[PDB]
Design a protein around this ligand. Sequence first.
Ligand SMILES: Cc1cc2nc3c(=O)[nH]c(=O)nc-3n(C[C@@H](O)[C@@H](O)[C@H](O)COP(=O)(O)OP(=O)(O)OC[C@H]3O[C@@H](n4cnc5c(N)ncnc54)[C@H](O)[C@@H]3O)c2cc1C
Ligand SMILES: Nc1nc2c(c(=O)[nH]1)N[C@H]1C(S)=C(S)[C@@H](COP(=O)(O)O)O[C@H]1N2
Ligand SMILES: O=C(O)c1ccccc1O
Ligand code: MOS
Ligand code: MOS
Ligand code: FES
Ligand code: FES
Ligand SMILES: [Ca+2]
Lengths: 99, 1299, 50, 50
Amino acid sequence: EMGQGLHTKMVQVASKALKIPISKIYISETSTNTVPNSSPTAASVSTDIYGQAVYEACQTILKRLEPFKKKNPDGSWEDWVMAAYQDRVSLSTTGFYRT
Amino acid sequence: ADELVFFVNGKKVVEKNADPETTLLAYLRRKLGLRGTKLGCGEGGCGACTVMLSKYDRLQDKIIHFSANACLAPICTLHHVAVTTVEGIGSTKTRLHPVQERIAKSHGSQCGFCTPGIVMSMYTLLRNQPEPTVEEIEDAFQGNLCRCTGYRPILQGFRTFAKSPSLFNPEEFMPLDPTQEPIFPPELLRLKDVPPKQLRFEGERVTWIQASTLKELLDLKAQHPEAKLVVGNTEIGIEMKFKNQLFPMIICPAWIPELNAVEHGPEGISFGAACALSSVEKTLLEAVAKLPTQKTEVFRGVLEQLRWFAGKQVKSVASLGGNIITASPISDLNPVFMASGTKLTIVSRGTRRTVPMDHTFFPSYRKTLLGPEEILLSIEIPYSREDEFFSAFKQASRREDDIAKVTCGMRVLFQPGSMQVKELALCYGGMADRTISALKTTQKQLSKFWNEKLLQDVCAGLAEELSLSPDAPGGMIEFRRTLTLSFFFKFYLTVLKKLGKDSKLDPTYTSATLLFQKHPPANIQLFQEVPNGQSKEDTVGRPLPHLAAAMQASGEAVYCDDIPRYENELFLRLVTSTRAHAKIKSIDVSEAQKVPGFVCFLSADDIPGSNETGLFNDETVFAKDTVTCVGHIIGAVVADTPEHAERAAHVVKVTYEDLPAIITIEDAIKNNSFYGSELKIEKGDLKKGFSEADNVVSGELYIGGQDHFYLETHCTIAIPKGEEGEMELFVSTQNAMKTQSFVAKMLGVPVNRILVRVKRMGGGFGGKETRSTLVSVAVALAAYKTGHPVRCMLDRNEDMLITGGRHPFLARYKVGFMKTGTIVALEVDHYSNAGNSRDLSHSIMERALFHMDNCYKIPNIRGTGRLCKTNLSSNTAFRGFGGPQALFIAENWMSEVAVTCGLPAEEVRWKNMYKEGDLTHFNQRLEGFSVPRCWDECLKSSQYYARKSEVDKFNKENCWKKRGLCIIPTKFGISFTVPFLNQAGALIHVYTDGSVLVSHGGTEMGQGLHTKMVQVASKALKIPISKIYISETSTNTVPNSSPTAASVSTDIYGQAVYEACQTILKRLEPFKKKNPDGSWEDWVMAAYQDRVSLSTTGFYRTPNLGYSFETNSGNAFHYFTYGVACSEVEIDCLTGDHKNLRTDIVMDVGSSLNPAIDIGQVEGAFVQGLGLFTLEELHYSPEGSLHTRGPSTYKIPAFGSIPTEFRVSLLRDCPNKKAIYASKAVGEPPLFLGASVFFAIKDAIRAARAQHTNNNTKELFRLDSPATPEKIRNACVDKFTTLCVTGAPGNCKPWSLRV
Amino acid sequence: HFYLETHCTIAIPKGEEGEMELFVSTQNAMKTQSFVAKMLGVPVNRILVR
Amino acid sequence: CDDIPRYENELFLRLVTSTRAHAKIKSIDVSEAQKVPGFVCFLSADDIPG
Ligand SMILES: Cc1cc2nc3c(=O)[nH]c(=O)nc-3n(C[C@@H](O)[C@@H](O)[C@H](O)COP(=O)(O)OP(=O)(O)OC[C@H]3O[C@@H](n4cnc5c(N)ncnc54)[C@H](O)[C@@H]3O)c2cc1C
Ligand SMILES: Nc1nc2c(c(=O)[nH]1)N[C@H]1C(S)=C(S)[C@@H](COP(=O)(O)O)O[C@H]1N2
Ligand SMILES: O=C(O)c1ccccc1O
Ligand code: MOS
Ligand code: MOS
Ligand code: FES
Ligand code: FES
Ligand SMILES: [Ca+2]
C-alpha cells in the first residue's frame, strides 16, 4: 500500500467473495514470511492479480465451510467457522494467480 | 570517589553516577546490553546469573578468578574488578569456547536458559584448574540449576576436560588452550600499584562508602553507628530485595587488609572477618592435609559444613564476618564456632576486645553482643587438642545448596587418655530463633564417662531441653527433634571410634559414623543406529543436537526479556491479594503515586472490553468486589523502570473484609465445594469382584503438588501499534492462540487485530499453556491504556505464588486380590485441589482416570474423580497432566498387594500386567504393547535379580543405613483427550535461492520440536537441513493452533510439515522431470520463472479419536508410549538423606526421530518426576498463604541428585506406524518413571522398620509423596523417634484405659 | 518522484543465525529481502521484510 | 516507517556519497568524522561480509 488503496480494494473483494461484511476483514501489512517471492507492486496490475489471488483463497475457504453451511443454513458465518474449527477443518489457505 | 571504574569482557566501564542499589545483573542487561546473563531467581539459588570476576590479589601477587551471582553483586563492590560474561569467552559469530562447544554438542542444553550460567561455572573452574578432576567438575555446579536436562549430559560432556552408536564424539572437540584465553585488562594491572582511597557513591535512596583503611571504617562507624556494613551482600541483598529493608548508608570494608589477613598462630588459624568462605575452605583444607588429624578436628567440622554451604558463587563472595553477624537461626557455621569457642576479635574506635563465642553471643533473634560502633575484625578457629573430638552435621531437604532444617556443632574434651568427660558442648541451629547450646543437658554429663548410660541420658535431656511448640515456625516438629538426638547418636558413636584410637564398634554400626561419600559416575546410553543404506542428508533417527544449542551456550539465543526495550517502553508490576478470600473494600494508590516514575495504576475499571477471562470464562482479568486466593490479581502499576513499578505496587493499600475460606481438599469435601459433577469410569462387577477376592486392602494416599520452576519465568512484551486496535506481543507461552483471543476479548477487538509471536521459552512444562495469559492480558491492557510498549517478567516469588502448579491429589482406595497377587477388584476415588478456577482441572482428572490402571489388567474396577474448588491459585497443566498422580496411586496399592501376599513385587506386577491385545478399563485395545520387552530387557540390563541379593546383604551388614530396589513400568496414552485439539497446521515457503522457511503451530520450549521439524522437512524434501529454517511461532502464519502440549507436537506438526513438503514436491515434479540432473536450486528457480507458487499450508487431523464416558467406548488415544525403570537407593535411617545409587531405563519411543533429543527427554522427565516424588514440596500457612516462594525453600533436583549410575536405552526395532516416520511421543511418558526411586525408598524404609520398629513383615505403613527426608526419617521408627513423639511425651499416659 | 515520504528503512538484527527483520518503505519486499541477504551472505530465509 | 518508535539502543545511519561524476577514489579520511560526538563507525566496502 502506497496510497492507491490496494488493501481497501482487496478487502472489498474478499468481502464479496466470502459474502460477509468488510468490517469482519482486515489487512495488517505486507511481509515476506506470509507471502514469498512476490513481484513488486507495479505495472498497475496489483488489483488485477492480488484481487484474483485473494479471490482464490476465499473460494478455498468457502469450499471448506460448505458442509457446515449445508448442515446449518440458518446459521451465522461465526457458527460455521466455529463448527469447522471444532471439526478440525483447517481455516487457513494460500491463494495464487498467473495471468 | 564519585567515579566507579571496572571492566566487562576486557572493555573499560566508567560509571559516573553509580547507584548503590544497582546489581551487576541489572547493569549488564540494561546498561551494557549484554543479555547472555539471565535472571532466574534473584535469590542466589539458581546460578543463571553466574559470571566470572577477576582481580589482582596483593598477597599472592597474582590474578585470581572466581564465580559470582550477578543478581546479588552490587556494582559498587566491583571497582577495579574485571568481569567476564558468557559473551566474553566466545560466540557463534566468532568462535565458541571449548566449554560452549562441548555443552552444546553433548546435548547438555535444552531450553537453554541455564546454559550461560553453567558455562561460566565450568569456565571459572578451568580458569583455575585446566585439568580438573571429575569431583571438582561436579562441585563446580553446586549453585547451578537446570530443569530440562536431568544434568547427566552436562556432566558427561564436561568430563572430557578431566584427566553401539554414541550421542556425541569427544574426538572432534577443540582442545582447551589456556594461552588463547582473554588477558587480564592491562589498565587494571597498572592501577594495582596505586593505594586504594575511600570512595563514595550516591544513589536514589542509598549512600555507599567504600572504606580503604581500618581507621576510616572505625571513624565512620563511630560517627554513623547506623551504617550497615556490606561485604558479599548475600544476606543484605536478600533483606533489601525480599524483606523490604532499606539501609540509607552502607559501608563496604572489603578492601581493608586487616579484614583479609590470615594468620597461623599457636592456638589456631585466624581469618580477617572479610575473608570469603572459599578462602577459609582453601586454607583449612591445606591445614588438614598438612597437620596431624588430632589437631584438625574443628577444622574438619567447618569443612564439613562448607561442603554443603550454598555453592561456588556464594562461597566466593560470602564472608566469615557476614555469616556470624547475620546471626541466622539456621547458620551452619555459628553452631560450629560456638561449640568450639572460636575466638572473635571485635573493635571500635579506640576499643578492642577478644572473646570466645559462647551461648551468650546471641542474645535474641538476629542479634549479637556487638555494640553499635563495633565491627568484627577477625576470627580464630581453634586447633584441636589431645583427647578432644569434634563433629558437625547438617540435614536439609536437598544435600546441595539448601537451608538447614537442623544443623549442629559438637565438641567433647576428655580427661587425659580417659573416657571421662571434662568439657562437652552441643550447639544447634534450626531449633530456636537463634543458635543455641544444650547447656542443661551437657552440664549434667561433666565428669561422667562416655557410655550407653550417657547416650540415653543425653538423648532424654535433648528431648526435654530442645522442645518445640506445635506452632514452631517451620513446622516439622517431630523430624527436627529426632534429628537433634540422631546427630548426637552419630557424634556418640564417632567418638567411641575415635577413643578406640584406631589410628571396637559393632560392624553393623560403623556406616553410621561415615560422612557423605561421592561415588564415581557411570552413564551409558543405548540407542539404534540408522540403516546402513540411509543417506547422510537424511538426519531422521540421527543424534542431531538441538538447532539452537550453540546460541544458547553463547548467550546469543534471544528469550522474551532479552529483546531490547523501546525508548518509550514502560514496566508493569501486578498488584495481588494477600488474603485467601475477602471482599475488596478499598484501594488506596496515594502513596504509590508519589513513587518516582509512577505512570498509573490499572484495575477492572480500565478494561475497555470484558473482565471475564479464563479457559472457562471462570476468571476476572482484575478482581472486582472480592479476591478468592492469595495472589489473586487485583490490578497493576505501570512505571518508568522495573524498580519503580515494584516499589509503587508494594505501597498500594488494599483494605479487605475476610470471607469464609476453603483451602484444603478436606475443606472442600466437608463443604461440598467442587467444580462440576463426579467423573467416573467403571467396568466389570465390583461386588462380585470383592466377593471372589481372597484379600482386601483399604487406605488413603496423598500426592503433594509441584511448581514448574522453568528457569525462565512468565514474561510478555505488548506493542500497541495505534491503528485499529492492533497489537503485537512477544510472549513466553506454549499457547499463542489463547493468548491472542484472551487479549482480544479483554480489549474488545476482533482476534485478527492481535499478533502473538513466540520465539522460544526457557522452559514451559505445562505451566505456560494457559496461565501465561495472567501476565499477557494485564500487559496488553497497559499498552492499550498508555499507547506505549509495555513489558513484564515475573520475579520467582510472584511466579510461584500466582501461576499455579501440579494438582495435589488425595485418594481413597480399596483393592481385592488373590493370595497369588492377582488383582480382582479395585475402587479408587480421586480428589484434586483445583484452586480458584477450572482451567484444565477437568481434563487433568480425565487423564488421571485413564491411567488409574497403569499397566495392569483389572477385571472389576471403578474410579471416580472430583475437582475441589478452593481459595488457592488455580492449578493447571504440568508434564504428566494427571497421569503421574493416578499412576502413583496405582503403584501404591500394587506395592501393598505384594507386601500383603508376601511375594516378590516384580512377580506380582508381571502376572497382573496387560498382554498384547487386551482392552483397558476404558475399553481401548492395547496394540503393540511393548512393556513386556522393556520389562525383560530392563530386568536383564539392570541385573535386577543379582542386585536384589546385594541389597539384602547390605541390609544385614548395616543397621543405620539401608538399601531399596524397585522396578516399575508405565504406559501413557498419546493425544489430547479433547478431540478437537488434535489438529495441526504448517506453512512453508521456498525462496528463489532455494532456502526454505518453515512455520508451524508448535512452540519451542527446549524439547527440540523445531529441530525435529527441520529434520522431518529435510528428509521429506530430500535436501540438507542446512537449507531449511524455523524462525518462530506466530498467529499470523499458522492460526488457531492448539497449545503445544500432550506430547503430540512432533506427531501432529511433523505430519502437517510433511504434507506441506509433499505439495511442494508435487509442484516441483514437472521441473525435476524436465531437468533430472539439475539441482534443488535449479528446479525452484525454474518453478518460479514458470510462475508456479512456492508457498503452501499443511494440515493434519489425528484419525479415529473420540472416547465417550457415557458408553465407555471410543478411542481416547492414538496409541501408547511405554517404558520401564529400575532404581536402587540407599537411605540414611538417622537423617532422612538418601543416595540414588543407580537407575536403568528402557523406553519405547518407536523409531526415534532423534535419539539425542529423545533420551534427553527421557532423562529430563525422569528427573522432574524424581523431584515430584522425593524432593519438591510446597508449604502453605493455614490461611492459604504460600511459604515456599523460591529456590532457597523449594528444592528441585540438583546436579548431585541424579542416580550415580544413570543408564538409558531406547527399545530397538519397534516401529510405530501410528506416527510420523514411525516415531513415538516422548515428552511426558517418562516422568512417572521417577517413581521407581520413590518405591525403592519405600523398600529401604521397610528394611529399616524391620530393623528397629515392629516385626510385622506384612505391615502396611502409609508413605505419601513426596518422600522427603522428613517423611523418610519419621518412617524409620526407632528409640529416637520414640523419645521425640510429637506431643504425648513421657508425661502423658491416660488415667484409665479399656474402651 | 517526490513521494511526500522519502526513502526509509529500519533494520533489526536478531543476533541469531544471521536473522534480521526490516521495516521498509518499499514496493518491493522480495528484492529488498534478497539484496539484503546477498550483501550479508546468508540464506534468504533468514531475512524478514515488513 | 520513521513513526515506529526507536529502540533504546537504536543507531542512525547517514550515507557518505560521491561529489564527482566520475573519478577514482584515491583516499578516504575519517579522522575528522571520528571526532564528532556520538560517532560509532564509518562503513565502507570492506565491511561487507557477503
Ligand atoms: C543462595 C544462597 C545460599 C545460602 N546458603 C547458606 C548456608 O548453607 N548456610 C548459612 O549459614 N548461610 C547461607 N547463606 C547466607 C550466607 O551467604 C551469608 O550468611 C554470608 O555468610 C554472609 O556474608 P556476606 O559477606 O554476604 O554478608 P553481607 O550480606 O554483607 O551481610 C552481612 C550482615 O553482617 C554484617 N557484617 C558483615 N561483615 C561484618 C564485620 N566485619 N563486622 C560487623 N558486622 C558485619 C552486615 O552489616 C550485615 O548485617 C546463603 C545465601 C544465599 C543468597
Ligand atoms: N526442555 C524442555 N522439555 C520439555 C518441556 C519444556 O518446557 N522444556 N515441556 C514438557 C511437556 S509438559 C510437554 S506436553 C512436551 C511438549 O512438546 P512436544 O509435544 O513436542 O513433545 O514436552 C515436554 N518436554
Ligand atoms: O489430554 C491432554 O493431555 C490434554 C492436554 C492439554 C489440554 C487438553 C487435554 O485434553
Ligand atoms: O512506475 Mo509503477 O509500475 S511502480
Ligand atoms: O503438561 Mo505438557 O501436556 S504442556
Ligand atoms: S538469578 Fe542469580 S542465582 Fe538465580
Ligand atoms: S536447559 Fe537447563 S533449565 Fe532448560
Ligand atoms: Ca484449576
